[PDB]
């Protein structure tokens, strides 16, 4: 209901023994879940806030060399020191100059010279680390009550926030029972090696190991108003002209430099604390306490009119908005599907048992008709309704699209991708272990290698497999090559 025609949402059906279904909740997308008898529900993750941050290694992306000083010494007289050398704010190096009788030194040759300067910092870019104590996720569960204002609505639902301390949570529903969540945030995204970087009004997440190797001055991040910057030499640059004197420049500001650098990073909009979007999290749905809500209700007999025309989504789902006529009883609208000239019921009703709670407000009934011609019946009377609809897709096309979606999910979620629709079974566990070993090997072997290099290595490996007589090696390397092509094509998204 919340998830209708948004971010290639899928529907994971089936329940294990004792009715736990495992689901990984990709952020920026969502899932829906039908059941044997329990009402269907859709879950979407959003607003993984992270609060109570800590600041360390604030860098500096600009300079202002205010005071400049110099000193010289005659050749073969040692290196000329400068009194402004031992302060915690001056950076300089020694260079050699040629001195003569025209410069005040009797001995001809090469002499020492220094040029030291104070280094004010401007526009610091503080680096913030996040700790798991204060992290908070938020998942919104919506039931398919078929309300008038329920389709594609981001507001309706019940928030069930989860924290790495209190992993378990039971979401209370309005007269539906309780839903049991056992999501695990200590896996999925790992913020131990991910550091939030905030500059100006924008923020980012960069891998920690990469956040100390980018060359810029850095400081303790104690915001004590007088930061003594480590490695000041990197930003300021000395130029020595053809022999003679020596002068110092500022090398401008690194704003666009940093903006260019953070190509592969994600975006985290921080207004109050931080609101990390583009998340990822695995969940478990303990679905025991889901009332069908329509056991006692009866199939009413009055006629039905529809407000808007029949419409479908990207997937095999049609959304029907029907209205009830003049009978006061809140009933259980029946449903059936028919063929062209024959009578065969095949169209699955994707939602729960639709119920008209009130006479005035319509109900949004959505379902999955079969491929080809479809006829829809919305009552027991002869004149209830007739909705004829033609679906375009084909079974092989649906299987191909499902495999494409599965491969896409595997590319991003990697080793945990098997857990997405996983129902407790040995084969899923075996594939999980095998793919986890292979993924560790692959990510370890390809770390930081970019997409163009991935595609080049893949095509080269495919060729080296196409011209070999060692059959087992040929097939192993060709499989690795094809996987490499696919990962290179899919990466960056």
């Amino acid at each position, epitope marked *: 209901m919340r998830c209708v025609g948004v971010g290639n949402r899928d529907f994971v059906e089936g329940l294990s023994g004792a009715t736990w279904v495992d689901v990984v909740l990709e952020h920026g997308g969502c899932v829906t879940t039908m059941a044997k008898n329990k009402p269907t529900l859709d879950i979407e993750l959003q607003k993984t806030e992270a609060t109570q941050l800590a600041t360390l290694r604030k860098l500096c992306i*600009e300079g202002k060399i205010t005071n400049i000083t110099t000193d010289s010494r005659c050749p073969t007289q040692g290196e000329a020191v400068l009194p402004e050398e031992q302060d915690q704010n001056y950076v300089c190096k020694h260079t050699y100059v040629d001195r003569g009788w025209g410069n005040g030194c009797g001995l001809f040759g090469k002499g020492s010279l220094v040029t030291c300067a104070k280094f004010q910092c*401007l*526009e610091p870019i503080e680096g913030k680390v996040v700790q798991y104590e204060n992290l908070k996720y938020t998942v919104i569960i919506t039931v398919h009550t078929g309300d008038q204002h329920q389709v594609g609505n981001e507001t309706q639902g019940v928030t069930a926030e989860i924290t790495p301390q209190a992993s378990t949570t039971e979401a209370i529903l309005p007269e539906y029972g309780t839903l049991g969540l056992e999501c695990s945030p200590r896996t999925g995204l790992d913020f131990n090696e991910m550091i939030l970087l905030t500059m*100006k*009004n924008k923020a980012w997440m960069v891998h920690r190991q990469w956040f100390f190797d980018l060359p810029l001055p850095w400081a303790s991040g104690a915001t004590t108003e007088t930061p003594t910057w480590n490695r000041k030499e990197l930003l300021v640059t000395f130029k020595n002209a053809h022999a003679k004197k020596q002068e110092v420049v500022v090398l401008g500001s690194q704003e666009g430099a940093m903006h260019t650098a953070l190509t592969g990073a994600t975006e985290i909009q*921080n*207004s*109050g604390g931080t609101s990390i979007f583009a998340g990822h999290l695995k969940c478990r749905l303990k679905m025991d306490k889901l009332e069908l809500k329509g056991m006692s209700y009866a199939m009413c007999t009055n006629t039905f009119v529809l407000k808007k025309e029949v419409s479908e989504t990207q997937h095999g789902t049609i959304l029907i908005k029907v209205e009830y006529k003049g009978e006061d009883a809140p009933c259980k609208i029946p449903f059936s599907t028919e063929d062209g000239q024959g009578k065969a019921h095949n169209g699955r009703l994707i939602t729960a048992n639709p119920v008209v709670t009130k006479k005035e407000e319509p109900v949004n009934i959505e379902a999955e008709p079969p491929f080809g011609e479809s006829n829809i019946v919305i009552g027991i009377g002869d004149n209830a309704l007739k909705i004829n609809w033609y679906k375009k897709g084909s079974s092989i096309g649906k299987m191909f699209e499902a495999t494409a979606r599965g491969a896409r999910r595997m590319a991003i979620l990697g080793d945990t991708a098997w857990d997405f629709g996983s129902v407790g079974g040995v084969l899923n566990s075996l594939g999980k272990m095998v793919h986890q070993i292979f993924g560790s090997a692959y990510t370890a072997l390809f770390s930081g290698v970019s997409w163009v290099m991935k595609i080049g290595i893949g095509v080269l490996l495919t060729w080296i497999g196409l011209n070999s007589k060692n059959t087992s090696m040929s097939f192993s390397c060709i499989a690795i090559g094809i996987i490499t092509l696919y990962l290179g094509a899919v990466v960056q998204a």
Partner: antibody
Amino acid sequence: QVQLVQSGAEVKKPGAPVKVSCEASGYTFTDYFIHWVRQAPGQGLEWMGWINPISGGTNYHPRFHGGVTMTRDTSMKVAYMELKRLTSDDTAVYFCARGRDFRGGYSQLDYWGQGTLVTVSS
Amino acid sequence: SVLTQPPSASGTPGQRVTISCSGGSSNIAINTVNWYQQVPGTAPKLLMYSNNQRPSGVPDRFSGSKSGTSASLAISGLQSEDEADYYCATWDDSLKDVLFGGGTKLTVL
């Protein structure tokens, strides 16, 4: 000392361009900013745009791009602003102020002039 | 966003009155606020050339800072000669322009 003469107030008719000259001597003009803040009678003053004398271009307030133009000269250390179109709205005194290039100093308007006044009528 | 500060009244006996400046998450919550007071009809002078640093304004009685999305100014021992309109201006970094406020009509009895 450092100051801005801002010439003298002049008033004109709608549909013609008016000029407001603004000279600041006494210091190296190149490094610092000129901000050109407008102030209406009995209303708050809003800033429009910088001009870097050495290499700067116009960076007007979003309300005023294509409504005003800013020029300058380095030899005489003067910044020129002119109104390409006078409607009935712009009936106010236009100012000058020295600004720093610091990120925290973009609003640093330390020194101001007298304020050249222009009003429009028939 | 945009900043809006309220006009208010006060009296000539010394008392702490707070000129609060309210902004957003991109204009004043990260940048240095600037406080101006203008004697009416002439060129406004600058009252605070940093977040809490005054260049030459009336010392020891004009001091204030900012908290999160809000910036404030505090005046002590306010007499009649301090009749002025007080302005808070912050640099907006999203829109690449400074954000001046509407203005406070601080009248002192």
